[PDB]
Amino acid sequence: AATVYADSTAAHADMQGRRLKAVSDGLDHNGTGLRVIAQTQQDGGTWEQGGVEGKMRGSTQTVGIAAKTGENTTAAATLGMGRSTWSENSANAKTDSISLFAGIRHDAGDIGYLKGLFSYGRYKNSISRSTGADEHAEGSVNGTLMQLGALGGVNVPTGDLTVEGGLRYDLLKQDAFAEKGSALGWSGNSLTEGTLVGLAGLKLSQPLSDKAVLFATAGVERDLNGRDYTVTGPHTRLVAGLGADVEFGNGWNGLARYSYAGSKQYGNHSGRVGVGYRF
Numbered sequence: 001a002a003t004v005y006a007d008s009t010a011a012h013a014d015m016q017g018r019r020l021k022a023v024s025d026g027l028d029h030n031g032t033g034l035r036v037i038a039q040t041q042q043d044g045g046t047w048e049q050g051g052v053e054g055k056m057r058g059s060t061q062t063v064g065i066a067a068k069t070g071e072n073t074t075a076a077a078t079l080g081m082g083r084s085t086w087s088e089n090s091a092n093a094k095t096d097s098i099s100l101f102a103g104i105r106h107d108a109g110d111i112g113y114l115k116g117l118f119s120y121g122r123y124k125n126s127i128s129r130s131t132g133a134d135e136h137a138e139g140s141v142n143g144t145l146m147q148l149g150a151l152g153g154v155n156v157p158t159g160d161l162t163v164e165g166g167l168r169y170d171l172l173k174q175d176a177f178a179e180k181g182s183a184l185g186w187s188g189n190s191l192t193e194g195t196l197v198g199l200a201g202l203k204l205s206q207p208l209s210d211k212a213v214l215f216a217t218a219g220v221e222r223d224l225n226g227r228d229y230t231v232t233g234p235h236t237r238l239v240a241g242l243g244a245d246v247e248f249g250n251g252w253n254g255l256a257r258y259s260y261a262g263s264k265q266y267g268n269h270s271g272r273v274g275v276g277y278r279f
């Protein structure tokens with residue numbers, strides 16, 4: 001039972017979906033010219049993954065730009081470096097990751113929009129697992145995760161209700177690996193796994209003034225097919241959330257988001273602070 005590799009990979013993919021959310025949220029904010037954006041997203045939950053409880057923690061720094069590329073078009077490109085962990089009985093794991101995120105949002109005048117999202121990242125999972133009495137196995141595995149996203153949104157309003165919904169496809173290719181350091185060390189084969197995710201969501205923006213807005217978010221998210229990262233060697237979550245963009249003046253804006261995702265046997269706190277500069 002090397003469930004620790006499946007689980008850490010799963011924990012990374014799950015974090016990656018929120019990283020993509022953040023870049024896609026960055027498509028909405030834009031007014032005038034071109035923004036440059038620096039962000040920290042922290043993550044923190046527990047997760048029973050088929051009999052095994054674990055604890056994920058995660059930190060991601062991102063730098064990004066977004067800009068009106070057209071009278072009705074917005075584009076964003078973000079670069080993200082992540083460090084996350086995953087714990088279990090007997091074993092824990094640290095994931096390093098480097099990811100590029102890209103998004104385009106086309107508006108149909110004021111009635112709604114479509115978004116395309118894409119991401120390519122690499123990851124490295126370092127596992128150590130107690131295998132005995134002061135005996136550990138160390139194991140190192142690389143993978144690639146790609147995401148593709150299509151969302152449509154309408155924009156009904158006294159402040160603003162946007163409804164938003166679509167799909168995200170996660171393609172994970174993970175390399176073969178082998179553990180050093182133990183006589184009951186384990187090897188595992190490469191793994192390709194593609195998962196469609198359905199997404200649906202509500203954003204209630206209320207502007208406070210000319211220089212600040214607060215939003216509430218409620219959302220739904222569910223794998224539409226299998227998401228098995230068990231190497232050879234599906235529940236709906238509700239997410240509720242809060243936010244606030246503020247214009248500090250002289251080009252600078254700030255950003256605060258907090259979010260909780262839940263299903264049976266899953267719970268994750270996601271937070272986010274961003275500082276921004278509009279040229």
Ligand SMILES: CCCCCCCCCCOCCOCCOCCOCCOCCO
Pocket residue numbers: 059060061062063064065077078079080081082083
């Ligand atoms: C967990 C610790 C990590 C600390 C590191 C901090 C991460 C920062 C990432 C560094 O890169 C920043 C730059 O990212 C910018 C995004 O790329 C924009 C590319 O622009 C394309 C050029 O435009 C052509 C016109 O279409």
